[PDB]
């Protein structure tokens, strides 16, 4: 009586501790190369920001009007998105983005500032609604008449909630030192801000910038997180963009950046710009910046795991 093992005409080559390209009976892949070029979002509350930039949801340019109080498990940023209508930017912007990406969405709350002896309805052709408008959640505070002085004002807001309040204000940098005076009067304009946690202050910087949206003025956007029962004071004398509403975070979410479509027919937890990595495999060679719950990124294109014995044909 004779015994033996099976074999095949064509084996699969694998690598071992000692040998390179030994043929085994059967093998199976261990590195995922297959991408699905869509954002598989089946079962998830998804918000596709489109033209609305993430940071814009807090301030309110027209493109963000339908996103002022969104709610999501999954937040998608798009290259076409913009945080701004009137030219400007956020100081410490990416920190804020990371916060908003996992906020699970936002909830808005009037801070209840009232004004006495100034203007309040600043607008621009960059923010198009009716006609000229402004940031929905903000207020452009002027001086009552086409020149004037600005009264050193002091507003305060207490966070009456059990969660930290996202406070955002703005600083306006006019084209000229002339323009600055036509809006808030002459002089050195000062904005000071404090909490039980925060210590800072701001002065404007009038001067000509490149024309963006048609304008050479800019707006500095600044932000801080007010802890429960802590209070924020705004000491200022012009060039000030005031928060109307404060923001509160809803819970928990994931934020990605993508150029592909949403698909509610496929499910996945591993996302990158080009789509979704659906896989059971422990590794992937698709995108090292993939986020969510992913197989480990590796450099190798392929790593075959032996699922059978050495293949020995006659």
């Amino acid at each position: 009586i004779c015994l033996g093992h099976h074999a095949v005409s064509n084996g699969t080559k694998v690598n071992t501790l000692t040998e390179r390209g030994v043929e085994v009976v059967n093998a199976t892949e261990t590195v995922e190369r297959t991408n699905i070029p869509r954002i598989c979002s089946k079962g998830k509350r998804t918000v596709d920001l489109g033209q609305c930039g993430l940071l814009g949801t807090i301030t309110g340019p027209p493109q963000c009007d339908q996103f002022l109080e969104f709610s999501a498990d999954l937040i998608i940023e798009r290259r076409e998105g913009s945080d701004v209508c009137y030219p400007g930017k956020f100081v410490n912007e990416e920190a804020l983005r990371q916060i908003l990406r996992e906020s699970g969405g936002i909830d808005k709350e009037a801070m209840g500032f009232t004004y006495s002896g100034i203007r309040t309805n600043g607008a621009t052709s960059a923010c198009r609604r009716s006609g000229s408008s402004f940031y929905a959640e903000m207020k452009w505070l002027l001086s009552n008449t086409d020149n004037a002085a600005f009264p050193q004002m002091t507003k305060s807001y207490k966070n009456t909630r059990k969660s930290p309040a996202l406070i955002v204000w703005g600083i306006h940098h006019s084209v000229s030192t002339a323009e600055q005076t036509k809006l808030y009067g002459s002089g050195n304009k000062l904005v000071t801000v404090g909490s039980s946690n925060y210590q800072q202050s701001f002065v404007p910087s009038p001067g000509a910038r490149p024309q963006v949206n048609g304008l050479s003025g800019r707006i500095d956007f600044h932000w801080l997180m007010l802890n429960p029962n802590d209070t924020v004071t705004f000491s200022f004398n012009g060039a000030f963009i005031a928060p109307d509403r404060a923001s509160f975070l809803r819970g928990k979410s994931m934020g990605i950046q993508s150029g592909v479509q949403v698909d509610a027919n496929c499910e996945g937890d591993c996302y990158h710009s080009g789509g979704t990595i659906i896989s059971n495999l422990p590794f992937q060679n698709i995108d090292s910046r993939a986020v969510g719950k992913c197989p480990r990124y590796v450099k190798q294109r392929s790593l075959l795991l032996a699922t059978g014995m050495k293949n020995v044909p006659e």
Binding site: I1, T30, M254, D269, P295, L305
Partner: protein
């Protein structure tokens, strides 16, 4: 191979044993035969299967962006990030390659191991009633009929009731 069989004092495998991994082939009077041992073929399959289920593995560890692909973060923090990321990639590429090599080596050796277990167990069924050819075949000194074959395969062959006859020979 770590156990000397499967390329091996057994010089090759059978591209016809499509019924299992390990098997018996016998030459006697009544013609010719070739079967498959299930218990050996299964133990190996169940061991390889165990590796599979262990490696096809899901992390429940979520990771978020610390980077920006539409608007680049500040260079310094950016370079630390990439430096870190690349370092971790090196570690995982290393882990992955080693893991797979280590596993393939062991997969192969246990496949070799299972063969040796089968052989060295049949050999023990056939005490002095047979002797070793050395190519994985057993020379029978009492001409087992096909029923005497299945007695070996199904592990019931008698350890003395062919003996002194086969001992004479």
């Amino acid at each position: 191979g770590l156990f000397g069989a499967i390329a091996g004092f057994i010089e090759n495998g059978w591209e016809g044993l499509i019924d299992g991994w390990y098997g018996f082939r016998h030459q006697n009077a009544q013609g010719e035969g070739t079967a498959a041992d299930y218990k050996s073929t299964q133990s190996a399959i169940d061991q390889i299967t165990g590796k599979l289920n262990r490696l096809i593995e899901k992390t429940n560890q979520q990771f978020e962006l610390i980077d920006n692909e539409f608007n680049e973060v500040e260079k310094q923090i950016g370079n630390v990030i990439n430096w870190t990321r690349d370092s971790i990639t090196e570690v995982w590429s290393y882990n992955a390659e080693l893991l797979v090599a280590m596993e393939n080596q062991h997969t192969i050796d246990l496949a070799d191991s299972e063969m040796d277990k089968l052989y060295e167990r049949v050999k023990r069924q056939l005490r002095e009633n047979a002797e070793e050819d050395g190519t994985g075949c057993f020379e029978i000194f009492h001409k087992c009929d096909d029923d005497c074959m299945a007695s070996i395969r199904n592990n019931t062959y008698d350890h003395s009731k062919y003996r002194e006859e086969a001992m004479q020979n």
